[PDB]
Amino acid sequence: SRSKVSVAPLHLESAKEPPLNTYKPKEPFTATIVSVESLVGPKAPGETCHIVIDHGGNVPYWEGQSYGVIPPGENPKKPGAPQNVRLYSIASTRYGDNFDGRTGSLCVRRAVYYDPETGKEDPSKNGVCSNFLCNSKPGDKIQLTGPSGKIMLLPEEDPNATHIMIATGTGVAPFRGYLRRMFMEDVPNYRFGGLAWLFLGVANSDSLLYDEEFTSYLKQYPDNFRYDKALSREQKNRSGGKMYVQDKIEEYSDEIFKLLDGGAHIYFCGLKGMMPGIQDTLKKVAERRGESWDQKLAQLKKNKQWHVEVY
């Protein structure tokens, strides 16, 4: 038959620039929720849900962009005004999880408030949008704006490029969309033959997102995909205790450096807190090799190989 899944409609490949701000906060598009499911097991430190939204083909986007969601209610402190937009990286390709160009998906972590001292939850302090999203049911309506963002657009000019993707938590979102486009979908004008390497840091095994899907690519494209995970509460003492994404990158430092020197693109997405550890690690690796990380970084920025979207 063939292994790549047919997608439609192919005219979504014809746009020359990505859509931007098609819908704005004062006049959002009203979309409809198709499904909401929890992505994590019982031991995860909090729920992360996968939400499929039907935009009916009216809010097209490119991989790596974000949708804005305006939760219902009035702005806590903007009397008579609407809630502010919250941005969520789109976790699906432009054809979406049903391969028909009508839906987009979000990967949303519930922001729950607990009294540090008493460990007591206080729902009045919970994050509004994230809980509204993971509480949704099929048929509920959502106000969408966007799409927004250009930083995380996938450079496709070289179908054989190297892409090293580093995520923590929900930062995996854009990468699920890149990888389906590279490996799962039958897109005639984009036939990937390079190397895609995904590093994913989470709390533990039960907190892994889309692991089954990424694991499958290992078995189908052993020569074009690599996947490494770091569980911060279930793995390895390196040069200090427990496992973070930086530790894994350290483990493969020579390869990574080699790839970066050859033109690889490198991407970071997820919680902003992941950045300092990573940068300390890269500096230390460079130093061991007798290189200046500062200079290398300036070069990667100049050549446009460095892509970061953290929040």
Where do contacts with ligand FAD occur on this chain (CB under 6 A)?
66, 86-89, 107-109, 111, 113, 125-130, 170, 173, 309, 311
269 is catalytic: yes
Two tokens at 283? 């500096």
Compute the distance between CA of residue 53 and CA of residue 34 in angstroms, rounded to an integer: 5
Give the nearest distance from C-beta 288 to ligand FAD in angstroms.
34
The backbone region for 157, taken as left when phi is positive above 0, alpha when psi lies in -120 to 50, beta otherwise, is alpha
Decide if 243 contacts 207 (C-beta within 8 A).
Answer: no
Check whether the bond before 123 is cis (ω within 30° of 0): no
Q: Is 308 helix (H, G, I), strand (E, B) or coil?
A: strand
Exposed, middle or buried by CB within 10 Å (0-12, 13-18, 19+), for 303?
exposed
Helix (H) or strand (E) run with residue 281 in it = helix 275-289
Q: Which is nearer to ligand FAD, 190 or 311 (CB)?
A: 311
Q: Is 87 annotated as a binding residue?
A: yes
With CB atoms as reference, the residue minimizing the distance to ligand FAD is 127
Give the nearest distance from C-beta 76 to ligand FAD in angstroms.
8
Give the nearest distance from C-beta 214 to ligand FAD in angstroms.
17
89 is catalytic: yes
Q: Is 148 annotated as a binding residue?
A: no
88 is catalytic: yes
Helix (H) or strand (E) run with residue 284 in it = helix 275-289
Q: Is 219 annotated as a binding residue?
A: no
Closest CA to 60 of 132, 109, 11: 11
Residue 82 CB partners (closer than 8 Å, separation 6+): 25, 70, 73, 74, 75
Choose, from 113, 114, 190, 311, the residue flagged as catalytic: 311
Give the nearest distance from C-beta 236 to ligand FAD in angstroms.
27
Choose, from 89, 92, 105, 136, the residue flagged as catalytic: 89
14 is catalytic: no
Q: Which is nearer to ligand FAD, 109 or 265 (CB)?
A: 109
Q: Is 73 annotated as a binding residue?
A: no
Q: Is 134 annotated as a binding residue?
A: no
Compute the distance between CA of residue 152 and CA of residue 155 in angstroms, rounded to an integer: 9
Choose, from 23, 88, 178, 221, the residue flagged as catalytic: 88
Q: Which residues are annotated as a binding site for FAD?
A: 86-89, 107, 109, 125, 128-130
- Positions annotated as catalytic residues are 88-89, 269, 309, 311
Q: Which residues are annotated as a binding site?
A: 86-89, 107, 109, 125, 128-130, 170, 232-233, 242, 270-271, 309
